[PDB]
Symmetry: C3
Subunit: 348 residues, 3 copies
């Protein structure tokens, strides 16, 4: 239902960076990318890529930068707004930023293809977002359905919501036809699922990626994988894409122009080859399993709000266990030290 | 709800082969198989195993061969008809061939156990097929529900449709009790999911096989895996079955009498052994990752319509990218050569 | 919705053991556990851990032992009752034992946190169990919703039922808010899915564990993995938990105090370490793939009813094949011996 049949690169940029300067710096550069360095989809990101006290400013910079520079940008532009299935405030915030940004007088709207909506819940949460797109279009004389909606799949409820999308989208009481991308968000998803790994590196969640690909094919949307944080790990990123491509998930998130170029290239067939036959640089060979002490520190002396929350599970578990198991209060001191116990018990 | 509690082998044969001769040759031989060489289920295949201009002839040969030879055939016989969730013509075609084939005057119907229906969509597409079985039974005085229906699961929508089968089958407005097999079709499925792999060998789709096994156990049907093309790769076929058997998927597709014998044997417990302890023939050791040039050729100078379509994705992707990214038009020539670019741009 | 935000250990004990003695021996000891040796959740198990002719006695011992010793027990107590989606008798049995056990005069109810219900089917089966909790609470003046309900997910239908739990629980016609744990039961599940493996060791069912974790996060329950039988295999148990923890499944079944301690410890962050870098005791290194002869014997000369049933598949398959394929009757004798064929044909 959309111009892009396939999207390989989904690239995010903070919208207002705090360090003095031009807070719209990241956006102006990124709006300058061309060729293999430019994403098929570009996401001025007013959500997690951007500190909350910066978000009203980020919304302004989005209009300023796309006003000034959007006509030229060779891919499609879809800013991520804030949203949360569990928070009416965040939802209203996301909507008011969508309404400013699309004010036709400001010159941004005509280079904007749609918005990306994070944290959606079950299908009745998607209908709330859909309802805000509809109202925004009507307030500004945009054609109905002209703003594409894309969602980040980053909770269990959203993963389930993809299963009856075909028949929900057909109901005449929503304009859910506007759906474009179903984008995995492995970071917040790890958190919502309360998963933990010893390195604190993300699980691979193959089933989420299968489900997101399936949902996309049944519903006529386009499936895209989420952020791959270890940016230096070029070969890892390529393994993950090759892996995603085997599931029919052909696009991935990109965090840097390097990742844009790798991701833009990977699903394209090779130049030449190839025959296969059966039988300081140390950092990409090491990993570190933190102790409780270290995990405490990596928030206590204190990576966005997704990386933060998503690392708090072994500690919320420890907390739960200590609150409810007085009989284990001794062995837990025996094991961490009276110091650390009483210390980990404050983080929540 | 069916005579076969378990089906190990699901074996297909073209119904009308073009090379002069007796076009029903493949069927007559296959109807001759006995013992470990005979499938539990045999599928005269009027769909993808058979060129479209041969299909009306294939339908006749089905009646001629099962008329002449069906009484003897020691397994169950279930011809695959044509069908497609997105094509009313194909659906009507499949139904008219079902109506001819089952004409009681022709002597085939009484050795026919049911039909296999490819390309089904969501549950309301299965109800269309179910409705055609019902009408065919009534037109020919067959008992209601006597023709078993089996579906190939080879789209995302069909994979989802298995989830509420129990309650849809109970509705008195369909005869969906007739469902017998839920058969994965990894070939067309790879396509519908737009998956690609570097060798162009099929992904393994473990989750589809899990879902198909689950759907079968919740709904009282029998789960069967799809075609395993690399026929010479005897050990691969056995690994895949052992793998399927761990998911509760106990039957697989068979493409040859060799595969029928391997598949007939594999789920049976071994003769003897065994103790396991912890720590030109080159073709089954090589594979070839084609270049864009080669992929172009393998359709441009030009494996059924499933293998064709299912290999067109890296090219439809390339096409999409070239149509929509003029800024990359240079680097794509830099990379494939002006020759190949302009050449790949015609295939659709 | 429950006091325990996280449950690491789900430990079962037979309720009435046949060997002369005090039939409540296992319960009295287990009610004595403290510290790292005590499970977060303890399951006096009146279902498969206990022979059927012992179950009315087991129900009495539950009241006797929790009466006498429950006040002290430092975790939560949730006895498993009998139940089966396909058996009205078993369901009524489970309910009558729940009604005795919770009689306020007997002194057990006030140390009981809820019950665990095995073998549930689709959501309308969960509503039957939910209805029995409601009636039991009313018969004994317990607050509504005070008995937590937990289900063992050990059929395909139950795995599917988790998908619309959020909206079913909200219906005012059930008290399904009481749901607490969604606990995989890989044993009976292997059976219901008709899976088989060469060693007869359980498949890993990663997708079930993904689905159960997802269902739990969408519905506000707590996901727990099922029994890990090879008790001596300490390192295996730790691999499985580390694996489960990557899916957000943070609790597992425990069969022994050893497993309680390993499981209680594993999700807690380590004491120290650790840096990782890229590149008679023979029993935990061997496994045995039984022949048909051996499989026949391991029921014919004859591990609970779950392990029994769950091992009967290669034989029910053999039986089906022999009943329906007379043309293979020779080759099956050629292969097993006339002796074994005619022998395996009696087990059902
Ligand atoms: Cl809310
Ligand atoms: Cl939903
Ligand atoms: Cl992982
Ligand atoms: Cl699913
Ligand atoms: Cl897609
Ligand atoms: Cl249609
Ligand atoms: Cl459907
Ligand atoms: Cl694969
Ligand atoms: Cl099955
Ligand atoms: Cl029943
Ligand atoms: Cl259900
Ligand atoms: Cl396995
Ligand atoms: Cl959980
Ligand atoms: K609509
Ligand atoms: K509408
Ligand atoms: K897809
Ligand atoms: K029906
Ligand atoms: K009917
Ligand atoms: K099954
Ligand atoms: K309720
Ligand atoms: K209620
Ligand atoms: K979870
Ligand atoms: Mg996120
Ligand atoms: Mg097919
Ligand atoms: Mg069980």
């Amino acid at each position: 239902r959309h111009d892009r049949e396939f999207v390989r690169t989904f690239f995010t940029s903070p919208t207002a960076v705090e360090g003095e300067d031009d807070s719209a710096k990241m956006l102006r550069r990124a709006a300058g990318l061309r060729g293999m360095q430019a994403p098929d989809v570009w996401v001025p990101d007013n959500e997690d890529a951007t500190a909350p006290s910066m978000r009203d400013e980020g919304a302004e910079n989005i209009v300023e930068v796309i006003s000034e520079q959007g006509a030229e940008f060779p891919g499609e532009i879809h800013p991520r707004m804030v949203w949360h299935r569990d928070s009416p405030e965040t939802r209203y915030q996301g909507f008011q930023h969508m309404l400013d940004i699309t004010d036709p007088e400001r010159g941004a709207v005509e280079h904007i293809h749609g918005f990306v909506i994070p944290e959606v819940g079950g299908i009745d949460d998607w209908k709330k977002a859909d309802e805000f797109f509809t109202i925004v279009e009507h307030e500004h004389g945009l054609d109905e359905g002209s703003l594409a909606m894309s969602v980040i799949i980053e909770s269990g409820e959203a993963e389930l919501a993809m299963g009856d999308l075909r028949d929900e989208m057909g109901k005449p009481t929503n304009n859910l036809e506007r759906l474009f991308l179903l984008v995995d968000g492995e970071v917040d998803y790890t958190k919502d699922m309360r998963a933990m790994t010893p390195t604190g590196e993300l699980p691979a969640w193959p089933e989420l990626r299968h489900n997101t690909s399936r949902g996309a094919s049944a519903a006529g949307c386009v499936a895209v994988d989420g952020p791959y944080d270890d940016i230096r790990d070029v070969e890892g990123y390529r393994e993950r894409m090759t892996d995603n491509q085997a599931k029919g998930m052909l696009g991935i998130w990109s965090l840097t122009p390097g990742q844009v170029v790798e991701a833009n290239t990977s699903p394209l067939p090779p130049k030449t080859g190839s025959w296969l036959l059966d039988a300081e640089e140390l950092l990409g060979l090491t990993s570190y399993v933190p102790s409780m002490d270290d995990i405490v520190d990596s928030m206590e002396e204190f990576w966005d709000e997704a990386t933060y929350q998503a690392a708090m599970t072994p500690i919320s578990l420890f907390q739960d266990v200590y609150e409810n198991r007085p009989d284990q209060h001794e062995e837990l001191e025996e094991r961490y030290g009276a110091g650390v116990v009483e210390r980990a018990m404050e983080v929540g």
